Design an enzyme around this catalytic site. Structure first.
Site, PDB file in Angstrom:
ATOM      1  N   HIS A  42       0.800  -1.232   0.000  1.00 22.65           N
ATOM      2  CA  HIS A  42       0.000   0.000   0.000  1.00 22.65           C
ATOM      3  C   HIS A  42       0.834   1.284   0.000  1.00 22.65           C
ATOM      4  CE1 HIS A  42       0.186   0.226   4.534  1.00 22.65           C
ATOM      5  NE2 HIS A  42       0.182   1.511   4.245  1.00 22.65           N
ATOM      6  N   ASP A  88      -0.572  -7.359   1.481  1.00 23.09           N
ATOM      7  CA  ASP A  88       0.035  -6.028   1.561  1.00 23.09           C
ATOM      8  C   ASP A  88       1.547  -6.262   1.736  1.00 23.09           C
ATOM      9  OD1 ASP A  88      -0.413  -3.028   3.715  1.00 23.09           O
ATOM     10  OD2 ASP A  88       0.377  -3.326   1.685  1.00 23.09           O
ATOM     11  N   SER A 185       3.818   2.239   8.768  1.00 18.92           N
ATOM     12  CA  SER A 185       3.471   1.294   7.703  1.00 18.92           C
ATOM     13  C   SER A 185       4.662   0.925   6.826  1.00 18.92           C
ATOM     14  CB  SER A 185       2.417   1.883   6.780  1.00 18.92           C
ATOM     15  OG  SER A 185       1.195   2.016   7.411  1.00 18.92           O
ATOM     16  N   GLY A 186       4.708  -0.354   6.502  1.00 16.17           N
ATOM     17  CA  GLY A 186       5.786  -0.924   5.714  1.00 16.17           C
ATOM     18  C   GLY A 186       6.973  -1.366   6.524  1.00 16.17           C
TER      19      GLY A 186
HETATM   20  C1  LIG Z   1       0.359  -2.120  13.177  1.00 17.98           C
HETATM   21  C2  LIG Z   1      -0.277  -0.821  12.894  1.00 17.98           C
HETATM   22  C3  LIG Z   1      -1.130  -0.037  13.643  1.00 17.98           C
HETATM   23  C4  LIG Z   1      -1.519   1.081  12.773  1.00 17.98           C
HETATM   24  C5  LIG Z   1      -2.341   2.194  12.912  1.00 17.98           C
HETATM   25  C6  LIG Z   1      -2.350   3.088  11.799  1.00 17.98           C
HETATM   26  N1  LIG Z   1      -3.203   4.190  11.908  1.00 17.98           N
HETATM   27  C7  LIG Z   1      -4.042   4.546  10.880  1.00 17.98           C
HETATM   28  N2  LIG Z   1      -5.026   5.462  10.960  1.00 17.98           N
HETATM   29  C8  LIG Z   1      -5.119   6.347  11.995  1.00 17.98           C
HETATM   30  O1  LIG Z   1      -4.646   6.198  13.119  1.00 17.98           O
HETATM   31  C9  LIG Z   1      -6.032   7.469  11.717  1.00 17.98           C
HETATM   32  C10 LIG Z   1      -6.535   8.113  12.847  1.00 17.98           C
HETATM   33  C11 LIG Z   1      -7.484   9.125  12.706  1.00 17.98           C
HETATM   34  C12 LIG Z   1      -7.891   9.459  11.413  1.00 17.98           C
HETATM   35  N3  LIG Z   1      -7.380   8.875  10.298  1.00 17.98           N
HETATM   36  C13 LIG Z   1      -6.455   7.885  10.459  1.00 17.98           C
HETATM   37  N4  LIG Z   1      -4.112   3.785   9.713  1.00 17.98           N
HETATM   38  C14 LIG Z   1      -5.169   4.109   8.724  1.00 17.98           C
HETATM   39  C15 LIG Z   1      -4.650   5.226   7.786  1.00 17.98           C
HETATM   40  C16 LIG Z   1      -5.743   5.964   6.975  1.00 17.98           C
HETATM   41  C17 LIG Z   1      -6.428   4.993   5.994  1.00 17.98           C
HETATM   42  C18 LIG Z   1      -7.198   3.880   6.763  1.00 17.98           C
HETATM   43  N5  LIG Z   1      -6.356   2.715   7.135  1.00 17.98           N
HETATM   44  C19 LIG Z   1      -6.411   1.494   6.283  1.00 17.98           C
HETATM   45  C20 LIG Z   1      -7.618   0.691   6.758  1.00 17.98           C
HETATM   46  O2  LIG Z   1      -8.247   0.990   7.758  1.00 17.98           O
HETATM   47  N6  LIG Z   1      -7.850  -0.528   6.176  1.00 17.98           N
HETATM   48  C21 LIG Z   1      -8.968  -1.357   6.627  1.00 17.98           C
HETATM   49  C22 LIG Z   1      -8.775  -2.684   5.900  1.00 17.98           C
HETATM   50  C23 LIG Z   1      -7.833  -2.437   4.753  1.00 17.98           C
HETATM   51  C24 LIG Z   1      -7.015  -1.168   5.131  1.00 17.98           C
HETATM   52  C25 LIG Z   1      -5.319   2.779   8.043  1.00 17.98           C
HETATM   53  O3  LIG Z   1      -4.565   1.820   8.307  1.00 17.98           O
HETATM   54  C26 LIG Z   1      -1.650   2.867  10.593  1.00 17.98           C
HETATM   55  C27 LIG Z   1      -0.831   1.724  10.453  1.00 17.98           C
HETATM   56  C28 LIG Z   1      -0.792   0.883  11.549  1.00 17.98           C
HETATM   57  O4  LIG Z   1      -0.045  -0.278  11.636  1.00 17.98           O
END
Ligand SMILES: Cc1cc2cc(/N=C(/NC(=O)c3cccnc3)N[C@H]3CCCCN(CC(=O)N4CCCC4)C3=O)ccc2o1
Ligand SMILES: [Ca+2]
Ligand code: NA
Lengths: 238, 86
Positions: A42, A88, A185-186
């Site tokens: 991603h 991913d 991420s990554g």
């Molecule tokens: C191990 C680990 C913990 C962690 C927390 C992370 N945090 C975020 N997002 C926020 O914390 C935030 C908070 C408030 C508003 N917007 C965003 N990742 C969000 C970033 C914004 C996009 C949403 N999306 C993807 C999503 O849901 N999918 C559902 C199924 C398929 C993908 C995230 O992954 C990011 C990486 C992390 O790896």
């Protein structure tokens, strides 16, 4: 990384940082060899151009032994699913080789069956990166690491608003305020066995950062060991 | 030694001492040295697997399997998975 500690000198030597055209870090990676970086698929869609920095512990201060490498080949897993983040995983082959030194060394890729029985059954693994130090906060200019307990698959699925595929796993805390976060991420999730660190996950996604009843979701490296091996046995342009 | 305190045909001396057959350890030769991967990782430094009901050890990138068939010998100052000392 929310909570945890800064990595000390030499402590997290396999960390890589993907930097965009503005030279800002936006995702991590893991060093696998002189030429290959492991990251999340991603991430590739979140900068038009990027390069890979190694050996950095402090991003607001060049400090010698840091190096920036261009990417020669991007190998995204063809089955990466944008809607679910299933598969991913990507590998990057670098134009020029990393020379290993203080703070710059590869993490071990484990054998699959062994990893399933001896690493994935441990209590915890360690996640690292330069991402946000608080959900509502900002990226660390300092590399941090965090010990995260493995969470069993049933608990993981029950916690999640989104499908947890067999290519993912949960790690982290129910309510303790510690987790990976955006910008991580990554990057590496590694598991120690007898003084040696093996790649067990790729930071993938999460509902917020360190939210009560939510865990971090990682790409499950065991499912991709064969795929990583194929991607790497490649060894330079013909 | 009158009670034969040494197990698995170990040899008892004398307040007493056990000299065990190969394949046994512990003070009283009561512990098998042969074992599978589920216990002490088969005595392997790194990877353990089973072939023909027997343990075989191996090593990750940057290591060679030592002649003893268990230890992993680095091939340079920066073998995989080790925090850097210098
Ligand atoms: C191990 C680990 C913990 C962690 C927390 C992370 N945090 C975020 N997002 C926020 O914390 C935030 C908070 C408030 C508003 N917007 C965003 N990742 C969000 C970033 C914004 C996009 C949403 N999306 C993807 C999503 O849901 N999918 C559902 C199924 C398929 C993908 C995230 O992954 C990011 C990486 C992390 O790896
Ligand atoms: Ca720096
Ligand atoms: Na939580």
């Amino acid at each position: 990384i929310v909570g945890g500690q800064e990595c000390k000198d030499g402590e997290c030597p396999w960390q890589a940082l993907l930097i965009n055209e503005e030279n800002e870090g936006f995702c991590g990676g893991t060093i696998l060899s002189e030429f290959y970086i492991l990251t999340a698929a991603h991430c590739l869609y979140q900068a038009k151009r990027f390069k890979v920095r190694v050996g950095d512990r402090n991003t607001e201060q060049e400090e010698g032994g840091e190096a920036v490498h261009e990417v020669e080949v991007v190998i995204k897993h063809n089955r990466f699913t944008k809607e679910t983040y299933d598969f991913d995983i990507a590998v990057l082959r670098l134009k020029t080789p990393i020379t290993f030194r203080m703070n710059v060394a590869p993490a071990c890729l484990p054998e699959r069956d062994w990893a399933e029985s001896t690493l994935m059954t441990q209590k915890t693994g360690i996640v690292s990166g330069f991402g946000r130090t608080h959900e509502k906060g900002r990226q660390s200019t300092r590399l941090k690491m965090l010990e995260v307990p493995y969470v069993d698959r049933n608990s993981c699925k029950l916690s999640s608003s989104f499908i947890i595929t067999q290519n993912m796993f949960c790690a982290g805390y129910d309510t303790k305020q510690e987790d990976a976060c955006q910008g991580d991420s990554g990057g590496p999730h590694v598991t120690r066995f007898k003084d040696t660190y093996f790649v067990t996950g790729i930071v993938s996604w999460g509902e917020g950062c360190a939210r009560k009843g939510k865990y971090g979701i990682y790409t499950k490296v065991t499912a991709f060991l064969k795929w990583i091996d194929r991607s790497m046995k490649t060894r330079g342009l013909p | 030694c009158e009670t034969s305190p040494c197990q698995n045909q170990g040899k008892c001396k004398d307040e007493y001492t056990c000299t065990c057959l190969e394949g046994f350890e512990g003070k009283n030769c009561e512990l098998f040295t042969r074992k599978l991967c589920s216990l002490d990782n088969g005595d392997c430094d790194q990877f353990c697997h089973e072939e023909q009901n027997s343990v075989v050890c191996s090593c990750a990138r940057g290591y060679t399997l030592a002649d003893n068939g268990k230890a992993c010998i680095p091939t340079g100052p920066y073998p995989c998975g080790k925090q850097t000392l210098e």
